[PDB]
Amino acid sequence: PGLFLTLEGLDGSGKTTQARRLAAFLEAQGRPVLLTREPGGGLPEVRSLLLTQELSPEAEYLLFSADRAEHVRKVILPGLAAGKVVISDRYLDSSLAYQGYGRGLPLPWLREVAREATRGLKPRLTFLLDLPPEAAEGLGLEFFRRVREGYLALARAEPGRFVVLDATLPEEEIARAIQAHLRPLL
Amino acid sequence: GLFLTLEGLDGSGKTTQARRLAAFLEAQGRPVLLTREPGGGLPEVRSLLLTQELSPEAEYLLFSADRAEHVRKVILPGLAAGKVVISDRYLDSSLAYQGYGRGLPLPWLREVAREATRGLKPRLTFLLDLPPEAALLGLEFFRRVREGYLALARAEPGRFVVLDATLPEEEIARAIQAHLRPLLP
Numbered sequence: 247p248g249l250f251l252t253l254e255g256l257d258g259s260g261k262t263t264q265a266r267r268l269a270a271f272l273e274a275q276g277r278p279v280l281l282t283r284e285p286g287g288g289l290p291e292v293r294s295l296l297l298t299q300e301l302s303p304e305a306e307y308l309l310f311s312a313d314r315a316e317h318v319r320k321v322i323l324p325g326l327a328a329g330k331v332v333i334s335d336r337y338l339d340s341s342l343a344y345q346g347y348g349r350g351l352p353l354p355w356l357r358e359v360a361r362e363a364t365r366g367l368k369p370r371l372t373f374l375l376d377l378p379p380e381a382a383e384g385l386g387l388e389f390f391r392r393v394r395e396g397y398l399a400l401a402r403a404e405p406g407r408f409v410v411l412d413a414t415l416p417e418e419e420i421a422r423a424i425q426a427h428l429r430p431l432l
Numbered sequence: 433g434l435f436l437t438l439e440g441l442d443g444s445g446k447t448t449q450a451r452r453l454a455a456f457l458e459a460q461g462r463p464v465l466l467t468r469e470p471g472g473g474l475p476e477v478r479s480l481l482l483t484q485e486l487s488p489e490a491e492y493l494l495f496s497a498d499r500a501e502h503v504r505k506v507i508l509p510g511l512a513a514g515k516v517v518i519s520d521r522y523l524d525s526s527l528a529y530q531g532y533g534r535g536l537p538l539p540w541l542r543e544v545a546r547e548a549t550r551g552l553k554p555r556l557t558f559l560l561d562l563p564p565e566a567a568l569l570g571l572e573f574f575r576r577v578r579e580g581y582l583a584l585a586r587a588e589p590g591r592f593v594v595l596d597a598t599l600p601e602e603e604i605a606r607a608i609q610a611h612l613r614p615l616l617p
């Protein structure tokens with residue numbers, strides 16, 4: 247039961263904006279909704295750990311995964327079991343784009359760590375707000391270009407799961423597009 | 433450099449023997465670095481785990497994040513400077529506690545560890561073995577851990593040295609020294 251949805255995209259791409267608009271939209275339709283986010287939905291203190299200066303990308307990813315493991319077990323799976331629409335503002339694809347394409351960590355390793363962390367849980371749809379890198383720990387332009395292109399590659403590899411939207415479109419037009427993709431599921 | 437670890441249950445004498453081992457090495461003029469897990473990489477992970485109860489998976493992943501920093505910032509640089517690096521707990525702790533204790537599958541733990549450690553393995557690991565009731569869930573968890581350590585040791589008899597932790601401090605230290613002497617001048 248339940249429906250698992252996520253929002254993805256670069257910093258400043260509108261994920262939180264659209265995630266919250268979606269939650270209220272579905273709540274107004276009488277649907278039970280659980281709005282959550284990463285990092286911090288499993289282990290809130292992970293945000294502190296993530297700020298540590300000079301963190302290796304390996305330790306960085308392992309922190310995101312620790313949070314993700316707790317998040318899936320304690321928040322997402324129980325919410326879905328109750329028949330809720332669970333919306334996560336970021337999920338695993340964030341690590342793949344940032345720690346994989348951005349930091350250069352090997353994707354298969356990321357995936358293998360993820361397999362137990364997530365228990366294989368994948369969103370039914372993922373809305374990728376595609377933002378030019380200039381518009382967006384070493385998070386400079388070259389990193390954001392890698393991450394931006396990584397997300398687009400992840401979307402090409404799973405074109406049924408990913409819905410790619412132009413993040414520069416007006417907020418209301420993006421929301422209407424998100425709603426239209428959901429209409430057949432809800 | 434030379435990488436050595438100590439392993440065993442809480443109260444098995446790890447920190448004590450790690451201290452005596454460093455002292456022995458100092459007496460021979462051998463540069464030594466004493467370190468520990470958890471907290472050698474990310475001190476905040478230690479303090480957080482002190483007061484927080486998590487899923488085994490999340491717990492292991494924090495120990496691994498800490499371990500990843502520990503290897504990179506402390507252990508590998510120590511070894512590159514030619515030090516004998518002693519870690520009071522390392523990967524075998526996760527295998528015994530999170531693997532055998534909490535039930536996580538070992539091959540998954542090891543694939544996570546593979547990038548976290550950069551494949552860095554101790555040359556020797558001294559396991560200070562004793563029943564949980566002799567250490568200086570209830571007891572069933574700690575028995576799973578103690579048996580897990582012994583499982584690990586019998587799978588890698590070239591790396592593990594298993595000592596009777598109930599012996600007097602000095603005898604154990606001399607036992608450790610005996611095992612180590614072939615690896616030094």
Ligand SMILES: Nc1ncnc2c1ncn2[C@@H]1O[C@H](COP(=O)(O)OP(=O)(O)O)[C@@H](O)[C@H]1O
Pocket residue numbers: 255256257258259260261262263264413414415416417420
């Ligand atoms: N479609 C949009 N066009 C222009 N600005 C937007 C749009 N959506 C959100 N914003 C604004 O951009 C900033 C970043 O939005 P936010 O939702 O925080 O992005 P993210 O959560 O992906 O970092 C906010 O100031 C927000 O008001």
Ligand SMILES: Nc1ncnc2c1ncn2[C@@H]1O[C@H](COP(=O)(O)OP(=O)(O)O)[C@@H](O)[C@H]1O
Pocket residue numbers: 440441442443444445446447448449568597598599600601602604
């Ligand atoms: N061989 C031994 N015999 C008796 N007491 C010991 C011995 N080794 C250590 N101790 C004492 O036992 C306690 C636990 O030792 P410690 O080195 O802290 O173990 P761990 O680091 O494994 O928890 C300490 O109070 C220490 O003084």
Ligand SMILES: Cc1cn([C@H]2C[C@H](O)[C@@H](COP(=O)(O)O)O2)c(=O)[nH]c1=O
Pocket residue numbers: 257284285310335336337338340341342344345
């Ligand atoms: C969830 C997640 C976030 N991030 C980054 C994106 C942001 O720069 C930062 C905080 O995310 P937030 O701004 O969406 O809360 O964490 C990763 O690098 N990997 C991840 O897995």
Ligand SMILES: Cc1cn([C@H]2C[C@H](O)[C@@H](COP(=O)(O)O)O2)c(=O)[nH]c1=O
Pocket residue numbers: 442469470478495521522523525526527529530
């Ligand atoms: C290093 C490590 C320790 N532990 C446990 C064993 C001890 O109970 C505790 C360490 O406590 P300490 O920080 O007071 O020595 O952490 C694990 O469960 N897994 C690990 O990987």
Ligand SMILES: [Ca+2]
Pocket residue numbers: 254255256259374375376377378394397413
């Ligand atoms: Ca984007």
Ligand SMILES: [Ca+2]
Pocket residue numbers: 261262263335
């Ligand atoms: Ca946001």
Ligand SMILES: [Ca+2]
Pocket residue numbers: 263264265267268420421422424425
């Ligand atoms: Ca929306």
Ligand SMILES: [Ca+2]
Pocket residue numbers: 294
């Ligand atoms: Ca803090």
Ligand SMILES: [Ca+2]
Pocket residue numbers: 284285286309310311313314
């Ligand atoms: Ca996370």
Ligand SMILES: [Ca+2]
Pocket residue numbers: 310311314338341356359360363
């Ligand atoms: Ca993960």
Ligand SMILES: [Ca+2]
Pocket residue numbers: 252253254336337338339340369372
């Ligand atoms: Ca996602």
Ligand SMILES: [Ca+2]
Pocket residue numbers: 296298300301306383384
């Ligand atoms: Ca960083």
Ligand SMILES: [Ca+2]
Pocket residue numbers: 418422
């Ligand atoms: Ca509208």
Ligand SMILES: [Ca+2]
Pocket residue numbers: 446447448520
């Ligand atoms: Ca100790």
Ligand SMILES: [Ca+2]
Pocket residue numbers: 469470471494495496498499
């Ligand atoms: Ca650790």
Ligand SMILES: [Ca+2]
Pocket residue numbers: 495496499523526544545548
């Ligand atoms: Ca590890």
